[model samples]
Each structure stands twice: as C-alpha cells, then as structure tokens.
Target chain A: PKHVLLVSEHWDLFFQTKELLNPEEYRCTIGQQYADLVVCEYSLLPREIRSPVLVLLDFFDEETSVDLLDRGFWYLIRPITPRILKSAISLFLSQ
Target chain B: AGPKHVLLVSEHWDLFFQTKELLNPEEYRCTIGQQYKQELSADLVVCEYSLLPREIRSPKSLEGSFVLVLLDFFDEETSVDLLDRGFWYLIRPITPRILKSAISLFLSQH
Candidate 1:
C-alpha cells in the first residue's frame, strides 16, 4: 500500500478524507516521514518538503498560489467533492 | 495562410505575458486584452476568470468561439456552471506544459 500523508487543522476534514481513500490501497497517516504523497492544507504545510505535494486552500490568493506553484506544489481549492479528491490523488499517484 | 488567431484576456500583466509567450508565434497569432472585449474575434479565446463580466457568461456572447478559462481558484459549483454555459476552465497553478497542451487539444478539435 502507498503511504499518504494527510495534514489538516480540522480533524473532521482529516477523517473524512481518510475515509474517501481506499484502505486497501492507501495508508493514510499524519506522519510526514515515509509518506509517498502529502495532502496538506496550504497554511499548514512546512517551509520545506518533498515534491508532488498537493495543497488545499479555502480561497484564492494570487501571490500565495503563484509562490506555491513556483515551489513545485500542486493545489486544489476547497468545496472539492469525494470523486474529485479521489481522481486528483489517483492522477498524482499514477505519475 | 495566416496563423491561427488566439485572443488572451487577463488583468494581470505578468499572467497575460506569460501565457502569450507560451504560444508559438509561428503557429498562433496572439492578441492580448486586459479584459474581455466582445468585438474581438479569434479561433480560440483564453480569458482569466476575474476578467469575465457576469453578463457575458453565456455561450452566445463570444459568437461561437472556443473559450478556455483560467481560474485563480476552484469551486465545484462554479466549474459546473461554466461548463454548462459552454466554457471550459483550468484552475490556477496551471503549469506551462498543461496550458500549452490544453490549447493544442482545443485548437485541434475546432
């Protein structure tokens, strides 16, 4: 199973996202170490991390978004559906 | 024969120039706009979401031109609404490669 690092300030979001990922395929945890993928809230992300980081945001801020992209982070704004989240993960994991 | 015309609309100079520079001048005749102008004509219209006025969100506004919208944020409802009105969108942080590919694909289809 691929290890997915799920980071968020809200416990509900963390649990809800974990539930969306297939348990057999993904091991979702809060630990950053040994994570194959990191799904984190924009504000919660550390200064430095691995590539293929998927950042989530509640709203659009041009300066911040551009900076994140420059640093090689992928992002999705909130109001995302279960299908969209799954699809985004699948797309990234495949690559 | 002339190169395929592409109209780009954006309020930000950086974004407008960056996107314009991505298109191959040999293949596309690119025109820049700070905001949407209804009188402009092109084979493909790529516009920033914020530049779009609420009144011109419909399909008929562009007179059958293929439109690709650049969004600063992603909202499921807004995305669906745009698609339903005959516009396609790409959320921000769009890489140069992805934007180029999308433009190529859309141009080929039309």
Candidate 2:
C-alpha cells in the first residue's frame, strides 16, 4: 500500500534543508501521500555513469512492471555525447 | 533530455493508464526485486516465457534481448533445463536488463 510518487519538479521544492547544497549534488523529493520528503545523493563521478546504460527493471508482481512504465521511469536514458554527458550527468538517470 | 520515454508495449498500455488514475503515482517507491520463480508457486501466472525476442531487444523496441542472453551458468537457477528450453537465465546484471528479466528473476535466494 506504500506505493506512491508525485513531483512536479525537483526535490528542493519539497524540503527546505536542501536549499543550502549546490544544486548539482543531490535530488530531493516530496510525495503528497506515500513517502515523506526525501533526497537521493547522485554520483559526481562520470565513469560510474559513463555510457548510455539501458535500465532493465525486473518485476516481481505484475503490478511492478506496470507501475514503473506508468511513472515515466524511462526518463533515465540520455545521449553519451561528450559535453552532454560531462556537464550534466545528473540531469539524466537516478542510479 | 528528450521527451519523456514511456515503455508500455503489448496490451499493457491500457492497464498503465488505469493504474496511474488509481495509484498515487508521484509518491513512488523504487525497489528492484529479484525474479526467482521455477514454476507457478502462487497466483503468479507463469505467462509464457517462450518469446522475449533475442534479436534487437531494448525496452523501447524489443523487450526480449534483455530477457535472454546466456550469461555464465552459475549452477543456481540458470541450469540446463532452464537454459536449453529458454526457461533459465541468471541476471546479476553486467548491464541492467529490464522488463523481461524483472518477471523472470524478481525474488531472493536462500
């Protein structure tokens, strides 16, 4: 029953504590219902995120598969162009 | 990024729409479950795993490539019968394969 995730933009809008950190370091999010406002620190390293990796999310129940696609989880992929990959790795994917 | 990508192939598209209306979609919890079913254990319908496309399988086009690719047989679930008949594959993931693998190995081993 805990499954819910809503966000119009970034996590900083949800949590005031995030206001101080550099805009590039982490992502904070708040849900209207299911999970409390939370922040996920993203990788600063490029190689760990290098290459346009395809995310294969294996589902357990039938609902898991449906849930992921519906939530726009496919927003994770991006171009590996030198500049785009370097300047804004955090702009794409949530690993 | 490009326009937000949605990977709803098959008849699952309509269900995807219905779920969004019913579920609190924005308040999402993400966990990559392990797919470890040998046969039908519960109401878990063992939908025919016979056709996950080996050729150009990506979530956008082919949901099958990620479903099958003989990694190394670790002697656990990816055994002889499981591999030969297209029923077995171990997915520890050198590359994170999505939907096909999800339904195949979404559980834990003891």
Candidate 3:
C-alpha cells in the first residue's frame, strides 16, 4: 500500500532495491492489484507503461545512503579513503 | 625466496598493479616484492589469493576480483620510501592492502 504503485518504471530503481532493504518496495502486483492506487495519470493498465512508473525516487536521496551504508557494500580500507560507501554500504553497491 | 611466479601487470590506461603470478585464484599467491625475497616460502598462507588485471571503478567494476596497485612514487629522492612509507585507503576508516591499493581505482582510469 504505497502512496503510488510502481510498475515498469526502470531497471535502475530495481538496482536500488537490491540495497539492504530486508523487504524491498517494488514488487509484482498481480492483475488489478494496484488498480486502487492514486494514479495521477492514466487508467489502470489503460495505457502502455513507459518512463514514469509509480515507484518513488526518495530512495535516491540522502537518507537511504546513510541508512544502508552499514549493512552493505565493500570496504577498500586504507589511509586516504573517503565517502559514505563504507564496506557497510559497499557490500551491496557493487558486490 | 622470490615469488614462485611474480608478474607485474601495468594498465597504462588506468591504475597499474602487480599481482602474484598464480592467476589460478584457488592457487594464486601474492608475489613478495624482491625486497621481501628472503622471507618467501611456497607454503606461505595465501589469503585472498585471486588476481586479475583490470580497471576498478565502483559499481561497474567491483565485480568480485581483487584489484592490486603497485605504484612507483617519487615524493623526493632517497628520502622517499619505495612502498611501505605511503598512505593508502579506500575510505576514511579502512585500509586497503596499502601497497596494492595505492594503484588508482578510479575510472576513465589512466
């Protein structure tokens, strides 16, 4: 039950979900499942899905980067190292 | 003893590195520098014994292969230590294999 339902948005967002979300946001909603979602545009499955999917880009902001840094990512560990991508964040960034 | 096999893989287009000759991941060993020649032994425990020559950009490149960087730094002259006396880090709080990590992991690499 999201503010909006996301479908066919783009694979990049899918990549982000691979982040340390114990339970991710984007998921498959069979049939008219997301039909009740607040569709700012288009009818339920009424139009061919394109660039704008219902998924949120909030994950692309500052909060998630910090939150996910600890349990994810690989750490290059050294002297001049810099960045939030602690091995904490790195375990998942590229793996 | 010198590494049973030591190959210096230089990537002029990107960060350069030197890896122990055993590319056989399961059998590879970090070639001890000539300076460490006397301390070499075939039976040395080879931790993380996998090496392949390539770029190390994040995301697109961190695909699970060990990246080594053997840098030749000339901060001064005789006063400059060859390898040991240098700073190396992938982040502020971690230590890359100082010697191998000096090699740049940046992309558009060279």
Candidate 4:
C-alpha cells in the first residue's frame, strides 16, 4: 500500500481527503513524516519533504500556481469534491 | 434524437484520438480539428489551449457552445480568468476517467 501524509489547518479538509483515499490502498497519516505522497495546504508544506506533494489552495494566484508547478508539485483549487479529489489522486499515483 | 456533437480541436493527433475514445460513441458524435474554425459548430468543444486563437478565446466568440480546455500548465489566476470568461479547464496529468467525467457532467447539465 502507498502511504500518504495529509496536512491541513482545517480538520474538515484533512479528514475529507483522508476519506477520499481508499483505506485498503492508502496508508494515511497526519504529520511531517515520510510517505509515498504528501497532500498539504500551501502554507503548511514542510520545507523539505522527500516525497511528491499535492498542494491545495483556497484562492487562485497565478504566480503561486506557476511556481508550484514549475517546482514539480501538483495542485487543486478549493471546492474540491470527494470524487474529484479521488480522481486526482488516482491520476497522480498512476503516473 | 441524434447523438450530441463534440468537436475536439488540438494539434496533437494522439490527444484527439485518446479524448475521442473516452466519450461513448453511442452518445457522442466526435469530430477532430487540428486548428480552430469560425464556422465549425458543435454541442461541446474540447480544445487544447495552444490551439485557440487569441481573439476568439472568450465567451462572446464561442457563445452557445460549451468549451473545455486542456492546458499543459497554468496558474490559479489563469484558471480563474478562464472560468470568468466561461471556459472550463483541466490541467495536465488528466486521466481518461477525469476527462470522461467532466464531459459527462457538462453534458448532463444542459
């Protein structure tokens, strides 16, 4: 199973993302720990995480989005539904 | 009733074929265009951002047709700008399921 480190200031968003990832396939944890992937808010991202990170944002900023992408990070805007989150994770992991 | 017409405009041949395969043939009549055409019409238009003409990249020019764009990379500001202009977008790493679901959701709405 792949491990995913989930981080967010909002409990609702944290739990929502955890719930979206299938438990059987993903070992989800909350902390700045080692994992196959890291799902975090832009502000909460650890300076030096070894794994690939997917950043979530509440608002859109062109500079920030481009910077993140150029740094090899994936991101999704707010209002992310469970289905869309699931699909995004699946697509990211598949690649 | 006839199937909904979907026009796919992209310079990439592979992208056109892959996108076309994602839509159910029975439900959609898919047409491919390597470049934009003012005369072309369809129920939905899925186009690569690079292929869109700068002047016609707005709701006014594409009025009456739903447009979804595939972008290689764009900032949040760009995404919001496009949305404000009445365009939907999906960034890179889009899987077949994601694309299919987006198309289905839009088709179901109107």
What TM-score would every model get versus the actual structure?
0.51, 0.19, 0.19, 0.51
- Model 3: per-residue Cα lDDT over B1-110, one tens digit each: 32232223322222213322213334334443322112323332112111211222223342232332333321222111211122112221112232232222211021
Tens-digit lDDT string for candidate 1 (A1-95): 88877676656666776787888988878743227788888778776754446887887666666566555665677776654555566545653
What's the TM for model 1? Answer: 0.51
| Alpha-carbon runs more than 4 Å astray in model 3 | A1-82, A86-88, A91-93, B1-7, B10-26, B29-66, B69-110
* Model 2 agreement with the true structure over B2-109: per-residue lDDT tens digits: 111223222334333443344333332112112322221121122222323333211323223222222322333223333333332322221222443233232210
Ranking of predictions according to lDDT: 1, 4, 2, 3
* Candidate 2: RMSD to truth: 17.8
lDDT of 4 by residue, B34-53 (tens): 88653345888888888865
Q: How much is the lDDT of residue A8 in candidate 1?
A: 68
- Superposed by TM-score, candidate 3 places the C-alpha of residue A8 at a distance from the truth, in angstroms, of 39
Backbone clashes (count) for model 3: 26
lDDT of 2 at B24: 31
What does candidate 4 score on TM?
Answer: 0.51
- CAPRI class assigned to model 4: incorrect
- Cα displacement (Å) at residue B48, model 1: 10
